[PDB]
Amino acid sequence: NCCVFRDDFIAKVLPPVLGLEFIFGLLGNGLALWIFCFHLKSWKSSRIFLFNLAVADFLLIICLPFVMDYYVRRSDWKFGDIPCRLVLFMFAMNRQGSIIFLTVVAVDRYFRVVHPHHALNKISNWTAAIISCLLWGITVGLTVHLLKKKLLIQNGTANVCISFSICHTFRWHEAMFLLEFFLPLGIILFCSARIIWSLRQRQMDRHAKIKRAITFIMVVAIVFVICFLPSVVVRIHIFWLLHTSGTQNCEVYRSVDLAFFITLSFTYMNSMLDPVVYYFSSP
Ligand SMILES: C[C@@]1(c2ccccc2)OC(C(=O)O)=CC1=O
């Protein structure tokens, strides 16, 4: 009897917003994959990591119509009782996989400006594919547990495919939702701080085009914070009522859960702005 409910205001927000993001997501990341496969004449180590970033976003954009149909049925999973776990495993894997390949690019850019002579900058394509394959391995390590757990809680006659329910339990999925964001913020922000400082200490900033390069190092951090921070702060807010003054009354959870469910739409926006900021902007 965990806190699960639905409202009508979200039905006037999510179906238009989620559908609109799907149009931009498919045209953006779909076109980006076209250039990588048939227009990139030299596949270096740096472009390999960026390619995986587009694959993760595309695997999430293709699943946007399925989750969109969930709301239009008044929050009812009409079909796919077993695919409910599948359609949710493909969502957390894409979200976490995008973050992992988002920090790697930031880490890769850090080693090219602060340690120009390091041997890591000259790794061959294969070595950049063995590392990339191992990164995909750890993505499913923290996500395949969705299949083991049972899902589709029945509210009498309705079906809801939700794993972010506001119920007082030490769930690994909820805890991993907080580690997937705080830890990269301690690496992405730190790496982007030295890149925007080493390029300034050595006076390379002035009288060069590199001003644009410094600008887009901060743009990446801005997009990451805007897309993921609001979802986290409303998740921690739920934990406050869950730990103290909660677990009994479901009315206090109504406001936060509705905000959390809507704020989750911020996450599928980083999969739309990534081709605009990462690939297309760069020459
Ligand atoms: C909205 C939702 C979803 C996913 C697939 C099918 C229905 C609903 O997306 C997530 C997620 O982004 O991880 C958790 C969900 O409950």
Numbering used by the authors: 17 to 299
What did the article's authors report about this structure?
Agonists were revealed to form a salt bridge with arginine, which is conserved in the HCA family, to activate these receptors. Extracellular regions of the receptors form a lid-like structure that covers the ligand-binding pocket.
First, in the structure of the HCA3-Gi complex, we identified the difference in the acifran binding position. Similar to the acifran-bound HCA2 structure, Y284 and R111 form a polar interaction with the carboxylic group of acifran. In addition, the aromatic ring of acifran is surrounded by a hydrophobic pocket formed by V832.60, Y862.64, W93ECL1, L1043.29, F1073.32, and I178ECL2. We then compared the binding pose of acifran in HCA2 and HCA3 and found that while the binding positions of acifran were almost identical, the binding poses were slightly different. The amino acids with the most notable difference in the ligand binding pocket of HCA3 are V832.60 (L83 in HCA2), Y862.64 (N86), S91ECL1 (W91), and V1033.28 (M103). On the other hand, in HCA3, pocket I cannot stably hold the aromatic ring of acifran due to the larger volume, consistent with a 10-fold decrease in affinity.
